[PDB]
Amino acid sequence: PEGLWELVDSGTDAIAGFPLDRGWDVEGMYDPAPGKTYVKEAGFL
Amino acid sequence: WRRRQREQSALDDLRYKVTWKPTAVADGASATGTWLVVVPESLAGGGWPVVVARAVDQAGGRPVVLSVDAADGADRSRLGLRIHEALGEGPVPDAVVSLLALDPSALPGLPDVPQALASTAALVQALLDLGLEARLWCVTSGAVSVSGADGPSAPEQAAVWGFGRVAGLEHPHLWAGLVDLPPEADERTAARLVGVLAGAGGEDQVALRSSGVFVRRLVRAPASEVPAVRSWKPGGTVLVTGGTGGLGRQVARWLARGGADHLLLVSRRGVDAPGADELVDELTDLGARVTVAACDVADRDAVQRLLSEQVPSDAPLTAVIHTAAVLDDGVIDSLSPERMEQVLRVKVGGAVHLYELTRESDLSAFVLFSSFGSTFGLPGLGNYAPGNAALEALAEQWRAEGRPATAVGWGTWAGGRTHGIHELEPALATAALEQALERDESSPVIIDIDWERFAVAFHAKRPTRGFELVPEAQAALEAA
Amino acid sequence: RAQARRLHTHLARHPHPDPTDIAHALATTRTPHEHRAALVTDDHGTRGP
Ligand SMILES: Nc1ncnc2c1ncn2[C@@H]1O[C@H](COP(=O)(O)OP(=O)(O)O)[C@@H](O)[C@H]1OP(=O)(O)O
């Protein structure tokens, strides 16, 4: 929780690129229609 | 049909690229003993030096601020005297932190060498001279681009990164790694910096940004599924530096074999080269208008007059392939600023001069021939890597400016790395470049590897986690 | 070892904590696991090292 407090108080934006070790075809599943998505970053653990 | 399919399979089986995997912010540890921070005096007390000094202060370590004059950083012996007298009357340092790469300036007297690379070379070989056992870390600002959100990467710190990558594989104990930093200095970023610096190891090549922390890895990027666009058409004049050589010969004959209007070969010797007549005979056999030139591309005036007088008026310049440089092999001990100057005079000076003389004529493409040593680093390639590494950063700078540049990384063409990487056949390499050209890949890596031997040998030379996203690399590592 | 390092870092960022309170918290409010260690000293100059 102290990590949460120092994160939110500092105003840090904790959004970064998609994980690469999860087996996702991250280079292929990005398209800014049929079955793709137009976002390449979100909050991830 | 079957021939084309088998060729495409075998060609996509040897495609690679480099990416920046995000990773979780490590818990880190506490700084122990005393850490020796070396800084350029041009910065003085500005941003990063004061902040990282404070960061190591509250991390439990003892800072040692060592301001260095701009001229002093070049010489290894003078830097040895400076580091010895600064470190005198005290305990030996546990680790060394180098902010020397933060200086954005060139070396006076040797104008085509950055102060960053020369300072880094001086520091490493000075620490070799002093016999210190302290692990070395070098921090850079804006040296690499982890994502499209980043700005273009500068050439100097990219050369530093290449030099560090090659150096680490032959001095594992001294060289720990590199840590890129964002443009501005912040307390939280410096806290994370000292945290990763105090870590055990393994994360040699990392970068820090506002979003998080990233680590450099290598991935396969096969071109089978990528659609094509803006197909390759060598119309007009096409300039090829170092045409008389081997790589120049291969790329010239590849250009001629299909849709070549005019091939302007440039070399220091040109006609006098051993096989210029024999080469140009077969090259003009394919209906190519060949005018081999005899001039150095390093000097600005020579290229300036060559782009005016030797260019046909019936064929404007479209493509500019840059595959010329001197092979000045040298071990880390024997490296000196003059060798770096003569190598960078051609590897970087020619390319940047050719680029700058453009912006008045549209170019279809601007190819640069980096080596796989920049991506990997090999023993003995101390002087070879930095120019190759700077070539990519020049490429991203040019795409940021909005020109069609490419920084193709090459293995060993079939024409001193017999272990690991195999010799690429000429036709396969040419086809790989052909398919990469229209796909607008900013940094392909066309190299053939037998991971049965390459991965285990590379790990034995230095353990690393760069080759983790390649499944063959993981199979080879866990096999042993 | 990780527990010791974490406790050291936590104690570094604290203005003069009471050692007996730390002893009570460590003894009572934490599970006794298998691999154990103890620090017994009557001066607040050796616990850090
Ligand atoms: N400063 C420079 N300006 C122009 N061409 C240069 C150059 N330095 C090297 N080259 C070319 O770079 C080419 C390199 O051929 P090489 O076999 O030595 O290395 P490589 O294997 O990469 O082609 C040479 O043909 C050389 O042209 P000369 O034969 O005329 O020397």
* Domain harbouring C25, CATH code: 3.30.70.3290
Q: Which of chain A's residues have a Cβ under 8 Å away from the Cβ of B212? A: 14, 16
- Specify burial of residue B144 (Cβ count, 10 A radius: 0-12, 13-18, 19+): buried
Selecting from B22, B217, B225 the residue whose C-beta is nearest the C-beta of A19 gives B22
Cβ–ligand 1 distance for B329 under 6 Å, the answer no
Token digits for B130? 């002093």
Work out the end-to-end distance of chain C between its first and last CA atoms, rounded to an integer number of angstroms: 14
Among residues B320, B302, B306, the alpha carbon closest in space to that of B362 is found at B320
| Segment 17-36 of chain A within 8 Å of chain B by CB | 17, 19-21, 27-28
Distant-in-sequence, close-in-space partners of B379: CB < 8 Å, separation ≥ 6: B169, B170, B461
Q: Report the SS3 class of residue B122.
A: helix
CB-CB neighbors (< 8 A) of A10 in chain B: 188
Query: Is the distance from the beta carbon of residue B351 to the nearest atom of ligand 1 less than 6 Å?
Result: no
Ramachandran sector of residue B369 (left: φ over 0; alpha: ψ -120 to 50; beta: rest): beta
One-letter amino acid at B373 equals G
- Spell B184-209 as b/e; 16+ CB within 10 A means b: ebbeebbbbbbbbbbbeeebbbbbbb
C8 contacts in B (CB within 8 Å)?
Answer: 30
* Number of compact structural domains in chain C: 1
Does ligand 1 come within 6 angstroms of the Cβ of B200? Answer: no
Element (H, E) at B428: helix B426-438
Do residue B60 and residue C12 have CB atoms under 8 angstroms apart? Answer: yes
Q: Would strands B15-23 and B62-68 be described as parallel, antiparallel, or unpaired?
A: unpaired
The rounded distance, in Å, linking the Cα atoms of B98 and B106 is 18
- Alpha-carbon distance B193 to B139, whole Å? 9
Kindly state if the Cβ of B276 falls inside 6 Å of ligand 1: no
Report how far apart, in Å, the C-alpha atoms of B365 and of each of B309, B372, B441 are: 22, 21, 12
CB under 8 A, 24+ apart: contacts of B184-189: B184/B47, B185/B47, B185/B48, B185/B51, B185/B52, B186/B51, B187/B51, B187/B54, B187/B55, B188/A10, B188/A12
Q: Amino acid letter at A16? A: A
Measured distance CA(B227)–CA(B246) in Å, rounded: 31
Residue B225 burial by Cβ neighbours in a 10 Å radius (0-12, 13-18, 19+)? exposed
Residues B14, B221 contacting (CB under 8 angstroms): no
Q: Is the CB of B326 under 6 A from ligand 1?
A: yes
Interface B–C counts its CB contacts (< 8 A) at 6
B409 close to B372: Cβ distance less than 8 angstroms: yes
d(CA B470, CA B464): 13
Specify the pairing of strand B412-413 against strand B423-424. Answer: parallel
Method by which the model was determined: cryo-EM
Distance (Å) from the alpha carbon of B363 to chain A's nearest alpha carbon:
28
Distances from the Cα of B264 to the Cα of B51, B88, B270, C33, angstroms: 52, 59, 11, 76
The β-bridge relationship of strands B106-107 and B95-98 is: unpaired
CA B440/CA B366 separation, integer angstroms? 11
Closest CA to B3 of B475, B427, B438, B478: B427
**Helix or strand or coil: residue B314?**
coil
Distance A37 CA to ligand 1 centre (A): 47
How far does chain B reach from its first CA to its final CA, in angstroms?
40
Inter-chain touch C5–B60, beta carbons under 8 Å: no
Report the candidate in B124, B121, B118, B102 with the shortest Cα–Cα distance to residue B49.
B102
Q: Give the C-alpha separation, B66 to B39, whole Å.
A: 6
Atom of ligand 1 nearest to the CA of B269: 30
What's the gap in Å between the CA of B18 and the closest CA on chain C?
34
Tell me if B241 CB under 6 Å of ligand 1: yes
Distance (Å, whole) CA B343 – CA C42: 65
CB-based contact B62:B34 (threshold 8 Å) = yes
Mutate to test the interface with A, among B150, B209, B210, B441 (most CBs of A within 10 A): B210
Beta-strand relationship, B95-98 and A16-17: unpaired
Give the pairing of strands B15-23 and B213-219: antiparallel
Domain extent, residue C47, equals: 1-49
In the block, tokens 């994980």 appear at: A19
Residue B242 φ/ψ, nearest 5 degrees: 65, 40
Measured between CA atoms, the residue of chain B closest to residue C49 is B32
B346 touches ligand 1 (CB under 6 Å): yes
> How distant is the Cα of C33 from the closest Cα of chain B, in angstroms?
22
Chain A hits for B188, Cβ within 8 Å: 10, 12
Place of tokens 């930095």: B386
Question: Which atom of ligand 1 lies closest to the CA of B324?
Answer: 12
Q: Which of B392, B343, B401, B441 is nearest to B143 (CA)?
A: B392
Chains B and A, touching by 3 or more CB pairs within 8 angstroms: yes
> ∠B132-B74-B109 over CA atoms, to 5°?
165
**What is the rounded distance in angstroms from the CA atom of residue B343 to the CA atom of residue B327?**
8
Resolution in A: 3.1
Which residue is closest to B21 within chain A, CA to CA? A20
Answer yes or no: is the C-beta of B183 below 6 A from any ligand 1 atom: no
